[PDB]
Design a protein around this ligand. Structure first.
Ligand SMILES: NC(=O)c1ccc[n+]([C@@H]2O[C@H](COP(=O)([O-])OP(=O)(O)OC[C@H]3O[C@@H](n4cnc5c(N)ncnc54)[C@H](OP(=O)(O)O)[C@@H]3O)[C@@H](O)[C@H]2O)c1
Ligand SMILES: NC(=O)c1ccc[n+]([C@@H]2O[C@H](COP(=O)([O-])OP(=O)(O)OC[C@H]3O[C@@H](n4cnc5c(N)ncnc54)[C@H](OP(=O)(O)O)[C@@H]3O)[C@@H](O)[C@H]2O)c1
Ligand SMILES: Nc1nc(=O)c2nc(CNc3ccc(C(=O)N[C@@H](CCC(=O)O)C(=O)O)cc3)cnc2[nH]1
Ligand SMILES: Nc1nc(=O)c2nc(CNc3ccc(C(=O)N[C@@H](CCC(=O)O)C(=O)O)cc3)cnc2[nH]1
Lengths: 159, 159
């Protein structure tokens, strides 16, 4: 199945120019925890933000222009993306905006983190019709000495 | 010697209720880089913020009360904090306010990170007199895809 994972600030802003200004170790653990041993799909831009291959996962990068690293798989199309993943029970799409818009129509599930941060950013998470997705898990956390803002993890399944 | 290391937002603000709303991996790496294999002294509140001892370093913590973790070393005063360090070339002071404030007087060096971030806080770094310190290292970095704010590393040695 195809799945998207992302953390969204208020307005669904997923990103800007530089790193999002927040510190959420608790979010990273969820991300890492849900990506574990699953192939991840990302957009060129996102990779650059990451900078190194996620360990223990197969990294597939989308881009119209050839590879710039050996540690990763480079593909030219969503179909090739998928294919390069082969038989796996779950496919993880990690970003960014362009990639999410592409895959959203194909995802069976969403792993969203909703952050209580209001930021000015240029990239957003695609719109998802409430009625087309079932919430099947949700869990909120306030901000603490370790996490800059409150957040709430959410799991939705395509109705 | 004793050295203070801290990351400061504008106005010398170093702390608030929750975690500082920034993401500066490079800063973190510089923290690690300058404190590894060296004794680290911090105050109780700061310990609660780290929530696990720092690896590869000797962790000492100040508190008027008995400790709550068998993993680190607890001291009742400054003098104990020091002595528990044992003969060492450099001792690192890592926060917070009260601690900095007590120790700044015996410091022969500061490791600062001046972060281009304007945040409202309630804890600050004490004042230092440049007439007192000689800057001996400086290096600024712009915000990027990994770091949320521009930041500048600075090393000052007492005059
Ligand atoms: O900004 P953001 O967060 O929206 O960035 P993001 O999705 O991380 O990545 C956007 C980039 O992904 C690559 N890409 C995305 N969709 C593609 C597709 N269908 N076929 C080929 N390459 C594709 C393109 O890289 P290239 O610009 O390198 O083609 C595009 O500029
Ligand atoms: N930005 C940075 O570079 C940086 C570095 C460090 C910290 N910080 C921040 O600094 C803040 C913590 O600062 P803070 O001033 O509130 O607290 P702090 O210095 O971390 O904690 C002080 C506490 O340690 C104990 N203490 C201090 N001096 C003592 C002494 N002489 N004898 C015995 N116990 C002593 C007391 O513990 P008891 O109450 O248990 O007696 C006191 O409540 C946070 O918000 C944190 O995030 C930032
Ligand atoms: N919840 C959620 N949070 C995010 O921050 C997020 N980020 C992406 C894409 N960006 C990134 C940026 C950095 C790292 C990263 O370091 N990944 C690590 C965490 C390592 C750590 O534990 O320090 C990983 O190991 O998966 C991952 C994804 C996609 N979905 C998200 N989903
Ligand atoms: N320059 C500077 N930057 C800071 O962020 C800073 N933070 C503290 C105290 N609070 C903390 C909070 C977290 C960690 C911490 O996670 N340190 C890890 C880095 C692990 C990682 O790289 O993610 C360590 O190994 O030191 C350290 C100190 C003290 N001096 C500072 N000094």
């Amino acid at each position: 199945m195809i799945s998207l994972i992302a953390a969204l600030a208020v307005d669904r802003v997923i990103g800007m120019e530089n790193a999002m200004p927040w510190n959420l170790p608790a979010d990273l653990a969820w991300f890492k925890r849900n990506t574990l041993d699953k192939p991840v799909i990302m957009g060129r831009h996102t990779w650059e933000s990451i900078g190194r291959p996620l360990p223990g996962r197969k990294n597939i990068i989308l881009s119209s222009q050839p590879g710039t690293d050996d540690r990763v798989t480079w593909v030219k199309s969503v179909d090739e993306a998928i294919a390069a993943c082969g038989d796996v029970p779950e496919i993880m799409v990690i970003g960014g905006g362009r990639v999410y818009e592409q895959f959203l129509p194909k995802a069976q599930k969403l792993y969203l983190t909703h952050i209580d941060a209001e930021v000015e950013g240029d990239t957003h998470f695609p719109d998802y019709e409430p009625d087309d997705w079932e919430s099947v898990f949700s869990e909120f956390h306030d901000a603490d000495a370790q996490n800059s803002h409150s957040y709430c993890f959410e799991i939705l399944e395509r109705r």
